[PDB]
Amino acid sequence: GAMGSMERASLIQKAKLAEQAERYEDMAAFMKGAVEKGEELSCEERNLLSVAYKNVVGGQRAAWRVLSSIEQKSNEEGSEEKGPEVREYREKVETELQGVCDTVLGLLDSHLIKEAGDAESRVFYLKMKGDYYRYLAEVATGDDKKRIIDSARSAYQEAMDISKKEMPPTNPIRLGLALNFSVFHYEIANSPEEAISLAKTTFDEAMADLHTLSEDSYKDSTLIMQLLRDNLTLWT
Amino acid sequence: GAMGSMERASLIQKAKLAEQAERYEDMAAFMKGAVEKGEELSCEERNLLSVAYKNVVGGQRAAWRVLSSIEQKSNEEGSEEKGPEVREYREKVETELQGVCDTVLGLLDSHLIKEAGDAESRVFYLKMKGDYYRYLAEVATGDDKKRIIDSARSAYQEAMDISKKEMPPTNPIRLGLALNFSVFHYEIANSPEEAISLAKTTFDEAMADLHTLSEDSYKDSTLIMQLLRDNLTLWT
Amino acid sequence: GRRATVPWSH
Amino acid sequence: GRRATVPWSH
Ligand SMILES: [Mg+2]
Ligand SMILES: [Mg+2]
Ligand SMILES: [Mg+2]
Ligand SMILES: [Mg+2]
Ligand SMILES: [Mg+2]
Ligand SMILES: [Mg+2]
Ligand SMILES: [Mg+2]
Ligand SMILES: [Mg+2]
């Protein structure tokens, strides 16, 4: 890897500088270099990795949706034939997006998940695995679509099982996992009732545990709880 | 070039799709491919080229300013030594920025400027040449700084001379050239009085010619005139 | 308003 | 407010 000659601490330092500069591709490359040093990641480092790749794939996903919408409009009755260019360029963006997802999944498989023994790290990485299979599912149209969807589901489910056993219902990792798995149910698995049930149950159990928290933990948990409520308002 | 096998019209079509998708690096690569076909560019195509590279270099410039500010703070008395990483990463962004400027300048020199005979195209490309030397000047600190500054000045000056002879004072290309050359004077050439004089004279001469314009031309010209006024308000 | 998902833990 | 420059003709 191109980062093999740089010190782990320098890669982490540069990832933080890249974030400040809004250079998310650089941030992700630095964090990939740090993961490939082979040591486990601290909580802060896990969040740098997640933030970096989410910004990268978020730009790709937004671009893919724009291009997919144009492509669908071109395939309506009455639309003039404009050639292969829209499909080709949508495919180019799609292939780049899939490559980033495969890169993240590769880091998780080699070897972040297998070395993650604490609940907070293991749930974090399994949520990430579910997220990046979910992004693959958003663009999948072929023979492997069902297996991609089931890979996301299986990763989310293992993360859910650990989080319910080992974390309080207000834990922000647990809350964000539930938020994302609920969205998976709603828009990937065609299970809006499961999505709504999960979001409501997660919100209500967190509400009942807020009394145990400091002011700063309360702020963290209620922020994600508001996102669950926002989705429930959209869906009902 | 990687775009050598794609049709000119397909490159233009994909540049427009990339713009819609906010994929400005792709947009610039498509437009570079189109320029390298060797044919002159239409007005619309010139604007696609300019918009694409401006978005690319604009991200790099903003990142460079963030990193340069951090680097300067690290070099104040009382700041803890953090190693070479800030300088290294600022240099990385700087080198990438310089490469993009050199790419644009290369397209202008091979061979957009020499084939541009109409005032609108020639002024457009000479303004671009001034702009991209100006971006090189923003980061220059060495033996060639004065020559980089003079290259920007010379390109802007030739564009100004043509624009005053061949274009009305409300022409949007002429107005944007004056806006940018005024900023060059203010913040590159250490000539704020020249910057203010140029902006004021440009604004006043455009104001006197607005009566000749259609509603749509009036809208185009007054928009840029407002930017001249905004700069004058900032500087006085 | 697009539905919400998050990448961070906190 | 940062001073204004433009890349486009129109
Ligand atoms: Mg070492
Ligand atoms: Mg495909
Ligand atoms: Mg371990
Ligand atoms: Mg516990
Ligand atoms: Mg041809
Ligand atoms: Mg340098
Ligand atoms: Mg010609
Ligand atoms: Mg004329």
Side-chain angles (χ1 to χ4, degrees), chain A residues 38-72 74-75 78-81 83-119 121-142 144-164 166-199 201-218:
Chain A
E39 302 283 2
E40 298 190 31
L41 305 192
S42 69
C43 179
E44 188 181 353
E45 293 162 354
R46 290 190 297 269
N47 280 281
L48 291 170
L49 177 69
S50 148
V51 165
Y53 277 107
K54 183 62 208 93
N55 277 272
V56 170
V57 80
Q60 295 170 322
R61 288 166 72 210
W64 186 95
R65 290 190 300 269
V66 166
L67 298 172
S68 182
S69 184
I70 293 166
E71 188 182 10
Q72 303 312 144
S74 82
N75 294 326
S79 303
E80 195 58 57
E81 173 64 38
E85 292 86 357
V86 170
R87 177 188 51 76
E88 284 170 352
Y89 184 50
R90 185 271 300 158
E91 280 173 356
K92 177 194 174 91
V93 172
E94 184 172 301
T95 300
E96 194 188 292
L97 182 164
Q98 294 169 318
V100 172
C101 292
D102 289 343
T103 291
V104 172
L105 294 167
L107 295 172
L108 294 172
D109 203 49
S110 300
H111 288 95
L112 288 170
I113 289 168
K114 65 177 57 67
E115 295 294 2
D118 292 355
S121 55
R122 196 165 180 82
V123 171
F124 189 97
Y125 292 135
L126 288 166
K127 174 189 168 291
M128 282 192 44
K129 183 175 181 169
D131 288 337
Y132 282 87
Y133 275 111
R134 174 164 59 84
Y135 306 148
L136 291 174
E138 288 178 346
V139 305
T141 66
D144 289 314
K145 183 175 154 113
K146 283 168 180 167
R147 275 179 284 269
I148 291 165
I149 290 175
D150 201 65
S151 290
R153 181 206 56 74
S154 180
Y156 285 137
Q157 189 63 59
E158 182 182 347
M160 287 291 293
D161 292 344
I162 299 164
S163 76
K164 295 214 253 183
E166 300 295 347
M167 281 162 213
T170 49
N171 177 280
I173 307 169
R174 180 167 166 180
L175 293 175
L177 164 64
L179 182 74
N180 286 18
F181 189 28
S182 166
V183 169
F184 169 83
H185 285 307
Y186 192 90
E187 77 179 22
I188 309 293
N190 195 27
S191 302
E193 289 174 338
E194 189 68 17
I196 293 166
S197 197
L198 178 56
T201 291
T202 300
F203 182 98
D204 287 350
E205 280 143 52
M207 176 70 40
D209 186 49
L210 289 173
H211 77 270
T212 66
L213 301 183
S214 71
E215 178 167 341
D216 287 343
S217 296
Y218 178 93

Side-chain angles (χ1 to χ4, degrees), chain B residues 67-72 74-75 78-81 83-87:
Chain B
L67 298 172
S68 182
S69 184
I70 293 166
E71 188 182 10
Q72 303 312 144
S74 82
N75 294 326
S79 303
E80 195 58 57
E81 173 64 38
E85 292 86 357
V86 170
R87 177 188 51 76

